[PDB]
Design an enzyme around this catalytic site. Structure first.
Site, PDB file in Angstrom:
ATOM      1  CG  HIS A 131      -2.052  -1.124   0.924  1.00  0.00           C
ATOM      2  ND1 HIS A 131      -2.092  -2.253   1.674  1.00  0.00           N
ATOM      3  CD2 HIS A 131      -3.070  -1.218   0.057  1.00  0.00           C
ATOM      4  CE1 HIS A 131      -3.076  -3.002   1.274  1.00  0.00           C
ATOM      5  NE2 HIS A 131      -3.690  -2.391   0.294  1.00  0.00           N
TER       6      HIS A 131
ATOM      7  CG  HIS B 197      -1.732  -0.299  -4.427  1.00  0.00           C
ATOM      8  ND1 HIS B 197      -2.323  -1.277  -5.183  1.00  0.00           N
ATOM      9  CD2 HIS B 197      -2.702   0.228  -3.649  1.00  0.00           C
ATOM     10  CE1 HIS B 197      -3.610  -1.328  -4.882  1.00  0.00           C
ATOM     11  NE2 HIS B 197      -3.861  -0.410  -3.924  1.00  0.00           N
TER      12      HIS B 197
ATOM     13  CG  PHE C  37      -7.264 -12.786  -3.819  1.00  0.00           C
ATOM     14  CD1 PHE C  37      -8.253 -12.063  -3.161  1.00  0.00           C
ATOM     15  CD2 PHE C  37      -6.334 -12.103  -4.592  1.00  0.00           C
ATOM     16  CE1 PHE C  37      -8.326 -10.687  -3.303  1.00  0.00           C
ATOM     17  CE2 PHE C  37      -6.386 -10.723  -4.705  1.00  0.00           C
ATOM     18  CZ  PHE C  37      -7.385 -10.019  -4.063  1.00  0.00           C
TER      19      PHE C  37
ATOM     20  CG  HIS D  17      -7.273   3.657  -3.717  1.00  0.00           C
ATOM     21  ND1 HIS D  17      -6.175   3.735  -4.530  1.00  0.00           N
ATOM     22  CD2 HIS D  17      -7.344   2.388  -3.285  1.00  0.00           C
ATOM     23  CE1 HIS D  17      -5.573   2.553  -4.568  1.00  0.00           C
ATOM     24  NE2 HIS D  17      -6.266   1.713  -3.812  1.00  0.00           N
ATOM     25  CG  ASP D  18      -4.984   1.830  -0.667  1.00  0.00           C
ATOM     26  OD1 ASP D  18      -5.980   1.712   0.097  1.00  0.00           O
ATOM     27  OD2 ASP D  18      -4.643   0.946  -1.470  1.00  0.00           O
TER      28      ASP D  18
ATOM     29  CG  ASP E 142      -7.914  -1.490  -4.507  1.00  0.00           C
ATOM     30  OD1 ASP E 142      -6.713  -1.203  -4.558  1.00  0.00           O
ATOM     31  OD2 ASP E 142      -8.567  -1.506  -3.464  1.00  0.00           O
TER      32      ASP E 142
HETATM   33  C1  LIG Z   1     -11.255 -15.555  -0.004  1.00  0.00           C
HETATM   34  O1  LIG Z   1      -9.943 -15.921   0.420  1.00  0.00           O
HETATM   35  C2  LIG Z   1      -8.904 -15.038   0.241  1.00  0.00           C
HETATM   36  C3  LIG Z   1      -7.633 -15.543  -0.003  1.00  0.00           C
HETATM   37  C4  LIG Z   1      -6.555 -14.685  -0.197  1.00  0.00           C
HETATM   38  C5  LIG Z   1      -6.706 -13.302  -0.147  1.00  0.00           C
HETATM   39  C6  LIG Z   1      -5.566 -12.314  -0.366  1.00  0.00           C
HETATM   40  C7  LIG Z   1      -4.201 -12.675  -0.928  1.00  0.00           C
HETATM   41  O2  LIG Z   1      -3.784 -11.854  -2.092  1.00  0.00           O
HETATM   42  C8  LIG Z   1      -4.021 -10.489  -2.217  1.00  0.00           C
HETATM   43  C9  LIG Z   1      -4.914  -9.815  -1.393  1.00  0.00           C
HETATM   44  C10 LIG Z   1      -5.177  -8.449  -1.535  1.00  0.00           C
HETATM   45  C11 LIG Z   1      -6.124  -7.852  -0.591  1.00  0.00           C
HETATM   46  N1  LIG Z   1      -6.665  -8.622   0.296  1.00  0.00           N
HETATM   47  N2  LIG Z   1      -7.599  -7.883   0.965  1.00  0.00           N
HETATM   48  C12 LIG Z   1      -8.566  -8.555   1.882  1.00  0.00           C
HETATM   49  C13 LIG Z   1      -9.353  -9.623   1.112  1.00  0.00           C
HETATM   50  C14 LIG Z   1     -10.752  -9.958   1.639  1.00  0.00           C
HETATM   51  C15 LIG Z   1     -10.825 -10.726   2.959  1.00  0.00           C
HETATM   52  C16 LIG Z   1      -9.976 -10.147   4.083  1.00  0.00           C
HETATM   53  C17 LIG Z   1      -8.479 -10.276   3.852  1.00  0.00           C
HETATM   54  C18 LIG Z   1      -7.844  -9.084   3.128  1.00  0.00           C
HETATM   55  C19 LIG Z   1      -7.526  -6.555   0.697  1.00  0.00           C
HETATM   56  O3  LIG Z   1      -8.099  -5.659   1.271  1.00  0.00           O
HETATM   57  C20 LIG Z   1      -6.591  -6.402  -0.493  1.00  0.00           C
HETATM   58  C21 LIG Z   1      -7.391  -5.989  -1.741  1.00  0.00           C
HETATM   59  C22 LIG Z   1      -5.465  -5.395  -0.181  1.00  0.00           C
HETATM   60  C23 LIG Z   1      -4.529  -7.728  -2.539  1.00  0.00           C
HETATM   61  C24 LIG Z   1      -3.646  -8.382  -3.396  1.00  0.00           C
HETATM   62  C25 LIG Z   1      -3.388  -9.747  -3.259  1.00  0.00           C
HETATM   63  O4  LIG Z   1      -2.540 -10.453  -4.074  1.00  0.00           O
HETATM   64  C26 LIG Z   1      -1.722  -9.756  -5.011  1.00  0.00           C
HETATM   65  C27 LIG Z   1      -7.988 -12.820   0.112  1.00  0.00           C
HETATM   66  C28 LIG Z   1      -9.074 -13.662   0.305  1.00  0.00           C
HETATM   67 MG   LIG Z   2      -7.524   0.435   0.401  1.00  0.00          MG
HETATM   68 ZN   LIG Z   3      -5.760  -0.156  -2.881  1.00  0.00          ZN
END
Ligand SMILES: COc1ccc(CCOc2cc(C3=NN(C4CCCCCC4)C(=O)C3(C)C)ccc2OC)cc1
Ligand SMILES: [Mg+2]
Ligand SMILES: [Zn+2]
Length: 330
Positions: free
Chosen positions: A79, A83, A291, A119-120, A237
């Site tokens: 962040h 980004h 994810f 945004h961040d 995002d």
């Molecule tokens: C369903 O199982 C999952 C499994 C894995 C992940 C995240 C792993 O990868 C990444 C995650 C994120 C983000 N993760 N989350 C949130 C996701 C929603 C649930 C809470 C956890 C944090 C963010 O707010 C952002 C967008 C920054 C960005 C870039 C990534 O890879 C480049 C999420 C969910």
């Molecule tokens: Mg954000």
């Molecule tokens: Zn962001």
């Protein structure tokens, strides 16, 4: 001189890809002296003629962009300003999608790009839940509700008040009130707690999709126009897994460094370690497939339907990247 330095020449050549998915944004960060957000925002503002349209003095734009970039933390692995630059450039490409040609006003375009850039801002590299569980001042200020997203907005706007930073100084009150409401609606929609409702509303819009004679999307009311801008910036995002694999893997290394650092801070304090934040109990590859399957693919598949067929190559890269990560699960 009166012509660019040699470093500036190579930066300008990399910035010729600014209209393309898969810009070498890490290379632009190195070549710009860690000014990816400033140079990419400036290039986009020139390309879309936003300085002339909104009578933005160029010195004021540069002063604000450098001030905004400085309030992104250099020590935060994901962040940060790179980004922000990435989400700006990705929003810029999504706005140029053929299915949206001539749909959005200059003010709505300005909203989506400014929202992407702020945004961040001032992200401390820990989650809302971390800030709430530690009784942080930020969690207290925002009553535990979209703590970071409220903070990003408040800093983004507050920085307009620094010396020669008010890029909206020549907009009418009517323009500023409309810009402000749209920027707030977009950034608050970046809170992942809103993802499921955003996606439901995008799905509803795909089922009831209306198209003009030009074959472009029809958006009559504010509610529909803002939902599309909210989902567009939300897609930007969550765009990392849709990028060429060399970029995706740098984003994955950065988010995992940031998550593991939060996990170390949680373990140090004896707090429960958050999902995927435990460097001793992590499956990076399995997490990325999850994810993509539960969050990114459902969002991008719904976006791809809205702008059919403009996003097919993005959806294809996403499915290729998903199979690559699946194939590396030990
Ligand atoms: C369903 O199982 C999952 C499994 C894995 C992940 C995240 C792993 O990868 C990444 C995650 C994120 C983000 N993760 N989350 C949130 C996701 C929603 C649930 C809470 C956890 C944090 C963010 O707010 C952002 C967008 C920054 C960005 C870039 C990534 O890879 C480049 C999420 C969910
Ligand atoms: Mg954000
Ligand atoms: Zn962001």
């Amino acid at each position: 001189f009166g012509v660019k330095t040699e470093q500036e020449d190579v930066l300008a050549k990399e910035l010729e890809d600014v209209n393309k998915w898969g810009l070498h944004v890490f290379r632009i960060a190195e070549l710009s002296g860690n000014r990816p957000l400033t140079v990419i925002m400036h290039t986009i503002f020139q390309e879309r003629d936003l300085l002339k349209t909104f009578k933005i003095p160029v010195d004021t734009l540069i002063t604000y962009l450098m001030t905004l970039e400085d309030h992104y933390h250099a020590d935060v692995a994901y962040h940060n300003n790179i980004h922000a630059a990435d989400v700006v450039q990705s929003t810029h490409v999504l706005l140029s999608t053929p299915a949206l040609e001539a749909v959005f006003t200059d003010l709505e375009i300005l909203a989506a790009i400014f929202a992407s850039a702020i945004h961040d801002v001032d992200h401390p590299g820990v989650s809302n839940q971390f800030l709430i569980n530690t009784n942080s001042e930020l969690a207290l200020m925002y009553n535990d509700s979209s703590v970071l997203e409220n903070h990003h907005l408040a800093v983004g706007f507050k920085l307009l008040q620094e010396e020669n930073c008010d890029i909206f100084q020549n907009l009418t009150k009517k323009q500023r009130q409309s810009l402000r409401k749209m920027v707030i609606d977009i950034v608050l929609a970046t809170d992942m707690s809103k993802h499921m409702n955003l996606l439901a509303d995008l799905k509803t819009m795909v089922e009831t999709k209306k198209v003009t004679s030009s074959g472009v999307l029809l958006l009559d009311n504010y509610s529909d126009r803002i939902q599309v801008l909210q989902n567009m910036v939300h897609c930007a995002d969550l765009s990392n897994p849709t990028k060429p694999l060399q970029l995706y893997r740098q984003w994955t290394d950065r988010i995992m460094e940031e998550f593991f650092r939060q996990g170390d801070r949680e373990r140090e304090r004896g707090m429960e370690i958050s999902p995927m934040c435990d460097k001793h109990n992590a499956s990076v590859e399995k997490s990325q497939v999850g994810f993509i399957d539960y969050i990114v693919h459902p969002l991008w598949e719904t976006w791809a339907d809205l702008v059919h067929p403009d996003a097919q190559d993005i959806l294809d890269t996403l499915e290729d990247n998903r199979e690559w990560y699946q194939s590396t699960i030990p």
